[PDB]
Design a protein around this ligand. Structure first.
Ligand SMILES: *[C@@H]1O[C@H](CO)[C@@H](O[C@@H]2O[C@H](CO)[C@@H](O)[C@H](O)[C@H]2NC(C)=O)[C@H](O)[C@H]1NC(C)=O
Ligand SMILES: *[C@@H]1O[C@H](CO)[C@@H](O)[C@H](O)[C@H]1NC(C)=O
Ligand SMILES: *[C@@H]1O[C@H](CO)[C@@H](O)[C@H](O)[C@H]1NC(C)=O
Ligand SMILES: *[C@@H]1O[C@H](CO)[C@@H](O)[C@H](O)[C@H]1NC(C)=O
Lengths: 49, 11, 49, 196, 49, 49
């Protein structure tokens, strides 16, 4: 699984090179991960899957 | 797991 | 000069048909999203004896 | 290798049990004598084939002379099916050409046995499951129930499981990759510095 | 503000003016770039603004 | 004898692109019973814009 920006950026956009919008998908999926991995006692099972 | 379908869906 | 010959089982000759497509590449087209990079192609059909 | 008179077929690697297809069997002659051929194929109960051009007798084929026939066939069984084709010569049929000796070796009939593949009919589709188990100095268990037989066909159902740990699949290349010399502005300096 | 082209392509846009010294105005039918494949150095297309 | 000649042509052979420049059309009528030909140069500046 993963997540993106909102499936395409709504306003007129793009023309290549990620202009003012680096597409930030790997970073945010990884932040999601790091959230999923976080727990005081120890994380659970499901967050691990 | 894998398998085949569509013996129906006929109109 | 151009030629073609179809080797076969035991390299024997095979009767049949052929179409060569000799081709230049990379025409004036922009080759991007509405444009074929395919440049001038000449197609030569033959009945291989 | 070679053969003075042989038979070769043509068909794809794999097919589908439901729909049919044709099987194209050519015969080839390289001996100077020009002979009528009796070509056919023995079939199993595991499918159903029918000819297109069986009623007419072939006439002859000479040196470098190749005839061809076909068979419209639908598979029944699943997996690999051997297809058998027998071709031989005939004497005393001097109607196509001048003569017809038709006296080959003890294996005068080319009796070739060829397999093919067939996949199970219907739109093939899948299902995925995953699980992370970690007995931390102990024991853990799980149970996974696999049941989706709505409007399905027998024996297309397959599954499989795979055990691993997948941190190391890409831990080689990227890890040895990016270890670089710092330079540039503070921005670029961080860019090159932080990742390491 | 949006508008549309009529049978004569005409639009009579009105703008109230209680504002700063000098004003700039533009109109388009598409966006501020030659959207299909503008960056190649080997492209041939544009749209007026 | 009556009316005038027509022809609808296809521009695929022209490659209406970056590095193929403006369009000159030279039309040459050979009037019969004189062999007499005369030309008109036309639409040289068809703005392939
Ligand atoms: C028919 O196909 C089957 C395989 O689907 C063949 O059965 C055996 O195949 C193994 C190799 O997997 C060979 O080592 C055996 O020799 C095969 N059995 C026989 C009959 O010898 C089989 O050879 C094919 N031919 C027929 C008509 O049975
Ligand atoms: C090309 O073919 C012709 C005859 O078809 C031959 O004369 C010639 O030498 C061949 N090779 C060339 C021109 O390089
Ligand atoms: C432009 O504004 C009008 C409302 O005045 C609206 O109907 C229209 O949807 C807007 N443009 C687009 C592309 O929606
Ligand atoms: C023009 O727009 C301004 C916006 O504040 C408003 O004050 C003014 O009344 C408008 N004049 C008109 C609609 O005539």
């Amino acid at each position: 699984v993963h997540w993106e920006r909102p499936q395409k950026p709504k306003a007129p956009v793009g023309h290549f090179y990620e202009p003012q919008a680096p597409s930030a998908e790997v970073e945010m999926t990884s932040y999601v991960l790091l959230a999923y991995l976080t727990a005081q006692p120890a994380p659970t099972s499901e967050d691990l899957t | 797991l894998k398998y085949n379908i569509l013996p129906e869906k006929e109109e | 000069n151009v030629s073609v010959c179809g080797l076969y089982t035991y390299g024997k000759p095979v009767p049949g048909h052929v179409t060569v497509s000799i081709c230049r590449k990379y025409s004036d087209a922009s080759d991007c999203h509405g444009e074929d990079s395919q440049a001038f192609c000449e197609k030569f059909s033959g009945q291989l004896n | 290798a070679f053969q003075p008179f042989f038979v070769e077929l043509t068909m794809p690697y794999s097919v589908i049990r439901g729909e049919a297809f044709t099987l194209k069997a050519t015969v080839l002659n390289y001996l100077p004598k020009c002979i009528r051929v009796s070509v056919q194929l023995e079939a199993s109960p595991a499918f159903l084939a029918v000819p297109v051009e069986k009623e007419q007798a072939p006439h002859c084929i000479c040196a470098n002379g190749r005839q061809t026939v076909s068979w419209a066939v639908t598979p029944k069984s699943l997996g690999n099916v051997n297809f058998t084709v027998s071709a031989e010569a005939l004497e005393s049929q001097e109607l196509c050409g001048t003569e017809v000796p038709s006296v080959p070796e003890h294996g005068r009939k080319d009796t070739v046995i060829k397999p093919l593949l067939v996949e199970p009919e219907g739109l093939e589709k899948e299902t995925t499951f995953n699980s992370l188990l970690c007995p931390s100095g102990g024991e853990v268990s799980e149970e996974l129930s696999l049941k989706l037989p709505p409007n399905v066909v027998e024996e297309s159902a397959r599954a499989s499981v795979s055990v691993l740990g997948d941190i190391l699949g890409s831990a080689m290349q990227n890890t040895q990759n990016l270890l670089q010399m710092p330079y540039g502005c503070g921005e670029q300096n961080m860019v090159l510095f932080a990742p390491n | 503000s949006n508008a549309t082209t009529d049978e004569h392509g005409l639009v009579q846009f009105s703008i109230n003016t209680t504002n700063v010294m000098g004003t700039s105005l533009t109109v388009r039918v598409n966006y501020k770039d030659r959207s299909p494949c503008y960056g190649y150095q080997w492209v041939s297309e544009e749209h007026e603004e | 004898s009556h009316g005038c000649f027509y022809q609808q042509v296809k521009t695929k052979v022209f490659q209406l692109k970056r590095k193929e420049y403006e369009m000159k059309l030279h039309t040459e009528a050979q009037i019969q019973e004189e062999g007499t030909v005369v030309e008109l140069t036309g639409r040289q500046s068809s703005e392939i814009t």
